[PDB]
Amino acid sequence: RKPRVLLAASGSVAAIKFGNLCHCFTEWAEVRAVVTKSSLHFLDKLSLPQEVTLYTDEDEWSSWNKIGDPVLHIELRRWADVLVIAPLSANTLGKIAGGLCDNLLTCIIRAWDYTKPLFVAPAMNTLMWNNPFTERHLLSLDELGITLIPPIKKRLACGDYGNGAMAEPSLIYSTVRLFWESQAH
Amino acid sequence: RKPRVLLAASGSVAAIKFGNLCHCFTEWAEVRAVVTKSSLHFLDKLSLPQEVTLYTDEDEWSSWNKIGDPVLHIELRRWADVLVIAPLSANTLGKIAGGLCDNLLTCIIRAWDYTKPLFVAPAMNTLMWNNPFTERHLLSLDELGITLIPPIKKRLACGDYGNGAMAEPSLIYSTVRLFWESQAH
Amino acid sequence: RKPRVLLAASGSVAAIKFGNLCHCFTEWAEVRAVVTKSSLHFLDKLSLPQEVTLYTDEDEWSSWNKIGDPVLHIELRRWADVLVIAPLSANTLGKIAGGLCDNLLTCIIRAWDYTKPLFVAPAMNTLMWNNPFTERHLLSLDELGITLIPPIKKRLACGDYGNGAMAEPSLIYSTVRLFWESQAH
Ligand SMILES: Cc1cc2nc3c(=O)[nH]c(=O)nc-3n(C[C@H](O)[C@H](O)[C@H](O)COP(=O)(O)O)c2cc1C
Ligand SMILES: Cc1cc2nc3c(=O)[nH]c(=O)nc-3n(C[C@H](O)[C@H](O)[C@H](O)COP(=O)(O)O)c2cc1C
Ligand SMILES: Cc1cc2nc3c(=O)[nH]c(=O)nc-3n(C[C@H](O)[C@H](O)[C@H](O)COP(=O)(O)O)c2cc1C
Ligand code: NI
């Protein structure tokens, strides 16, 4: 008990709320954060909880100097009871569906065992949300067992057809915590 | 009327004729150009029409400083009545079929609505043209609604089986203009 | 006779044995080596046979200055009777299955004709080996005609379910040489 939650941000404008999302999980769980290089255009590091360790692509090397040593993506994958990607960019979505491993975040996921819960809160402009790759990539992740926390539809301009703003932090948090408490530990 | 045509070059040796292709469209349409980083090994910037604005991956940041501001890939996608990729590299072809968004060009395409016409003129060495991923990726783009302007087969050494040199600018131009005039505006 | 063997390393910790693997092939064949940028974190250049030319992504430009000139990925693809990727990373595996061409190694492969033998010795941590993309990507490469030289299962901690350490150099070598001698030249 006291779940180990790995929170990740990818290169979406919604990464500006990532510090806030981290704040939601920290009383309840042990939180560690992973970010992509593009997410750093949108995230303020001083907005995170001070107790949260933020790992970047460069940390993949700071742990590993010689053969034997710990590999960070593998170490974070073993550590976690759950992984939450919020926001999940269109590009990261595609790289996960492509089975790629070119940075800390996709390499943790390419090492993933789908018996451990993995939640994603996609965040993208409505025109990317409605492009046919959104549904194809999310259907693939769904078949693998990922849990989609759907974006806010009718947000800001609506139109009613999907829309793509990231789910609110409070919903992402409650969805993961209610899951947990229904069972895992 | 006076169609807004987005012309793009990817990292093929045929990008050296991209300035010429731009010249073909400028009396008839409002033209804007997008290039990939690899295309700049092959394109001379002084060969473009002087009235054509060339956008690069770096322009994605020059428009966007703070939340609210215009995102260039989305802005170019809204602006365009049609998108023409000529040349279309094997790598860009694969990234489009993979639904990726890692630069201005693939992000415009990952935001695409296939009710708007999208034409591609693939350009690659015969050995890549004949590799089985060429047919698989082009069949996928075809199913989405892209329009292939086939490469020149029997060019330079022929052999008769595909061959891969980019379609001539005059054919790319006439194909897009005859389409337009048959209907869109 | 005296086969032309292209040996490649990708970004796996098993690339530290790449010099040794090269040594296995050099009396029997003409050997040329290709490496990815990530493989250079793990390979010592002084461990290669002195007669082996090592090509990197930067060599793609040192051959090509102007239109007409030789393109290295195409030149290496024509030269080779066989290609051996050992180690084959999870990321390279995914990029090959994605039909991408973003560096010397994937571009040689994206130009490949599967009538020429292509052997791969995957090397990855057990958790990536057991992730479902390993089997999906290897099934795709198999259908194309690639020859898998399976990783060592029961290695170091076993568990019995796959396991991922790269096949020993001696097995990779004997598998390719017995194939050759059964027929090609
Ligand atoms: C100003 C700007 C805003 C961006 N916003 C989004 C977004 O909200 N959602 C999305 O999917 N992509 C967005 N993108 C594009 C991604 O940042 C780009 O695909 C990036 O490669 C994603 O990298 P990552 O997935 O490794 O983090 C935006 C790009 C720019 C320049
Ligand atoms: C000298 C040279 C010539 C190239 N010519 C071609 C070509 O004609 N067609 C193609 O598909 N790729 C070609 N490539 C490989 C692409 O440039 C490489 O895949 C690049 O990543 C494509 O980037 P892009 O698709 O983002 O523009 C060539 C590479 C080199 C070094
Ligand atoms: C310390 C360390 C060890 C690595 N070991 C492996 C490995 O053994 N197998 C693998 O598939 N990936 C491994 N990776 C991840 C790859 O290096 C990373 O995916 C890289 O992008 C692969 O690049 P490449 O395929 O272009 O060479 C490791 C990464 C790090 C930081
Ligand atoms: Ni990439």
Contact state of C112 with B131 under an 8 Å Cβ cutoff: yes
In angstroms, rounded to a whole number, what is the distance separating the alpha carbons of residues C62 and A152?
A: 50
- Which residue's CA is the closest to the ligand 3 atom numbered 13? C12
> Distance from CA of residue A91 to its chain's centroid?
13
In angstroms, rounded to a whole number, what is the distance separating the alpha carbons of residues A168 and A1?
A: 25
Ligand nearest to the backbone CA of C163: 3
Q: Which residues of A138-160 are buried (b: 16+ CB within 10 A; e: fewer)?
A: beebeeeebbebebbeeeeeeee
**Three-state secondary-structure class, residue C13:** helix
At A180, give phi and psi (nearest 5°).
Answer: -50, -60
The verdict on B40 touching C (C-beta cutoff 8 Å) is: no
Q: Which residues of C touch A113 (CB under 8 A)?
A: 127, 130-131
**Three-state secondary-structure class, residue A62:** helix
Q: Which residues of A touch B77 (CB under 8 A)?
A: 127
Measuring CA to CA, which residue among B94, B82, B97, B132 is closest to residue B11? B94
Pairing of strands C53-55, C82-88: unpaired
**Which residues, 6+ apart, have CB-to-CB distance to B130 below 8 Å?**
B161, B162, C113
Measuring CA to CA, which residue among A81, A76, A79, A7 is closest to residue A47? A7
The binding site of A for FMN consists of 11-13, 36-38, 89-92, 123
In angstroms, rounded to a whole number, what is the distance separating the alpha carbons of residues C109 and B161?
A: 20
Closest partner residue to A102 among C91, C127, C133, by Cβ? C91
Which H or E run includes C173?
A: helix C169-182
Closest partner residue to A111 among C41, C127, C136, by Cβ? C127
Q: Is C130 annotated as a binding residue?
A: no
Q: What secondary structure does DSSP assign to A83-134, as a single string?
A: EEEEEE-HHHHHHHHTT--SSHHHHHHHT--TTS-EEEEE---HHHHHSHHH
The number of the ligand 2 atom at minimal distance from the alpha carbon of B36 is 27
Torsion angle in degrees (nearest 10) through CA of B38, B39, B45, B50: -130
The secondary structure of residue C135, as a DSSP letter, is H
Pocket test of ligand 3: the residue of A71, A76, A103, A108 to mutate, having most ligand atoms within 8 Å of its CB, is A71
Determination technique for this entry = X-ray
C20 lines ligand 3 (CB under 6 A): no
Q: How many CB atoms lie within 10 A of CB A46?
A: 7
In terms of residues, how long is chain B?
185
User: What order do you get walking across the sheet with C82-88 strand by strand?
Assistant: C53-55, C30-35, C4-9, C82-88, C118-122, C147-148
Q: Which residues of B touch A133 (CB under 8 A)?
A: 99, 110
Q: What secondary structure does DSSP assign to C46-104, as a single string?
A: GGS-TTPEEE-TTHHHHH-SSTTS--HHHHHHHH-SEEEEEEE-HHHHHHHHTT--SSH
User: What order do you get walking across the sheet with A82-88 strand by strand?
Assistant: A53-55, A30-35, A4-9, A82-88, A118-122, A147-148
The verdict on B157 touching C (C-beta cutoff 8 Å) is: no
- At residue B139's C-alpha, the angle toward residues B137 and B143, to 5°, is 115
The amino acid at residue C127 is L
Closest partner residue to A100 among C13, C41, C91, by Cβ? C91
Could you tell me the two tokens for C80? Answer: 């080779």
Kindly calculate the radius of gyration of chain B based on its CA atoms and give it in whole angstroms.
16
Residues B104 and B57 sit within 8 Å (Cβ to Cβ): yes
Q: Is B73 a catalytic residue?
A: yes
In angstroms, rounded to a whole number, what is the distance separating the alpha carbons of residues A71 and A63?
A: 7
How many interface pairs between A and B have CB atoms less than 8 angstroms apart? 47
SS3 for A134-159 is HHHHHHHHHHHCCEECCCECCCCCCC
Residues A23 and A5 sit within 8 Å (Cβ to Cβ): no
In angstroms, rounded to a whole number, what is the distance separating the alpha carbons of residues C41 and C182?
A: 36
Ligand nearest to the backbone CA of C104: 2
Distance B120 CA to ligand 1 centre (A): 24
What is the residue whose two structure tokens read 């991209």? B18
SS3 for A73-95 is HHHHHHHCCEEEEEEECHHHHHH
Distances A180 to A78, A121, B102 between C-alpha atoms, Å: 17, 17, 34
Contacts for C174-179: CB closer than 8 Å, 24+ residues apart: C175/C119, C175/C147, C175/C149, C176/C5, C176/C25, C176/C82, C176/C84, C176/C117, C176/C119, C177/C28, C179/C117, C179/C119, C179/C147
Q: Which residues of A touch B137 (CB under 8 A)?
A: none
In angstroms, rounded to a whole number, what is the distance separating the alpha carbons of residues A85 and A88?
A: 5
- The crossing angle, in degrees rounded to 10, of helices C169-182 and C18-26 is 30
Q: Which residues of C touch B132 (CB under 8 A)?
A: 114, 144
**Which residues, 6+ apart, have CB-to-CB distance to B28 below 8 Å?**
B2, B3, B177
User: What order do you get walking across the sheet with B147-148 strand by strand?
Assistant: B53-55, B30-35, B4-9, B82-88, B118-122, B147-148
Contact state of A71 with C125 under an 8 Å Cβ cutoff: yes
Q: Is A158 a catalytic residue?
A: yes
Which H or E run includes A72?
A: helix A72-79
In angstroms, rounded to a whole number, what is the distance separating the alpha carbons of residues B34 and C66?
A: 23
Distance C3 CA to ligand 2 centre (A): 28
Ligand nearest to the backbone CA of B128: 2
Mutation target vs A (from B60, B77, B101; most A CBs, 10 A cutoff): B101
Could you tell me the two tokens for B7? Answer: 């012309």
Domain B1-185 classification at class level: alpha beta
**Three-state secondary-structure class, residue A176:** helix
Which H or E run includes C137?
A: helix C132-144
Residues A71 and C125 sit within 8 Å (Cβ to Cβ): yes
Closest partner residue to C99 among B127, B130, B133, by Cβ? B133
At A106, give phi and psi (nearest 5°).
Answer: -70, -30
Neighbouring chains of B at 3+ CB pairs under 8 Å are A, C
Q: Which residues of B143-173 are buried (b: 16+ CB within 10 A; e: fewer)?
A: eeebbebebbeeeeeeeeebbbbbbbbeebb
Tell me the structure's resolution in angstroms, rounded to a single decimal: 2.0
